[PDB]
Amino acid sequence: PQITLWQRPLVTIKIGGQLKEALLDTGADDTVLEEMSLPGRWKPKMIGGIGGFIKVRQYDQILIEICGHKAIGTVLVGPTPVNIIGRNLLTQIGCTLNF
Amino acid sequence: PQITLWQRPLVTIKIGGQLKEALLDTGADDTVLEEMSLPGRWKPKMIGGIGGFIKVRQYDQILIEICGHKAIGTVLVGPTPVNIIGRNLLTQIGCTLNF
Numbered sequence: 001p002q003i004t005l006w007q008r009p010l011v012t013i014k015i016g017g018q019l020k021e022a023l024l025d026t027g028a029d030d031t032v033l034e035e036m037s038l039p040g041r042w043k044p045k046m047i048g049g050i051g052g053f054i055k056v057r058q059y060d061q062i063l064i065e066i067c068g069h070k071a072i073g074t075v076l077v078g079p080t081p082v083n084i085i086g087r088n089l090l091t092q093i094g095c096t097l098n099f
Numbered sequence: 100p101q102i103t104l105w106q107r108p109l110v111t112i113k114i115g116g117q118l119k120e121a122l123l124d125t126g127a128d129d130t131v132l133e134e135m136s137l138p139g140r141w142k143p144k145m146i147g148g149i150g151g152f153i154k155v156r157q158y159d160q161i162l163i164e165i166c167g168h169k170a171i172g173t174v175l176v177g178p179t180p181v182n183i184i185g186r187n188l189l190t191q192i193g194c195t196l197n198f
């Protein structure tokens with residue numbers, strides 16, 4: 001699809017058997033999701049944003065479906081306010097910016 | 100231009116007579132720039148991101164040139180770690196997401 005930016009660019013994702021809504025975020029290196037129950041082993045990590053840092057649990061090679069496109073990569077889970085699909089997964093679904 | 104997301108989507112901007120690099124950020128509602136000297140009056144404000152909040156100075160009706168496209172809008176200035184062009188200006192330069 002082509003998405004204009006008058007509204008937040010939200011998509012439906014399916015991850016760990018659960019449906020969620022998430023922001024397509026070209027400003028995000030990595031993918032960061034609300035506290036959620038994910039299968040497998042993780043690793044503690046800290047990521048920084050505009051206001052400081054949050055602790056996240058990092059899971060590698062997780063399958064996500066992003067608006068009907070499948071990707072596999074790293075997902076971080078923690079106290080983010082919004083679910084964010086970052087460039088590590090946007091590249092896999094072929095997402096580009098155009099103007 | 101068409102920008103893929105294998106690297107950060109950075110563009111050059113000219114704002115307040117100064118040249119800066121900035122991130123095209125579909126996850127940012129507003130435009131937030133590192134500490135800089137802007138002319139005119141501002142308004143104190145607080146905005147939230149992944150790690151908490153920062154206090155910013157809000158300047159309205161600011162002219163920016165973003166990779167050769169001119170826009171006028173609100174710019175927030177404060178302790179962000181990256182210059183961020185948010186959706187208030189991305190819409191004006193006709194930026195879309197595509198996959």
Ligand SMILES: CC(C)CN(C[C@@H](O)[C@H](Cc1ccc(F)cc1)NC(=O)O[C@H]1CCO[C@H]2OCC[C@H]21)S(=O)(=O)c1ccc2nc(NC(C)C)sc2c1
Pocket residue numbers: 025026027028029030031032047048049050051082084086124125126127128129130131146147148149180181183185
């Ligand atoms: C997190 C999202 C919802 C908002 N954020 C933009 C995202 O694109 C941020 C942009 C950024 C890049 C780099 C940075 F160092 C800091 C910040 N990316 C991000 O946090 O990425 C994290 C995690 C992913 O992995 C990494 O990616 C790089 C850093 C890691 S925001 O900046 O906080 C921001 C912007 C404008 C704005 N206007 C408002 N208006 C209100 C009045 C409603 S609120 C608001 C908040």
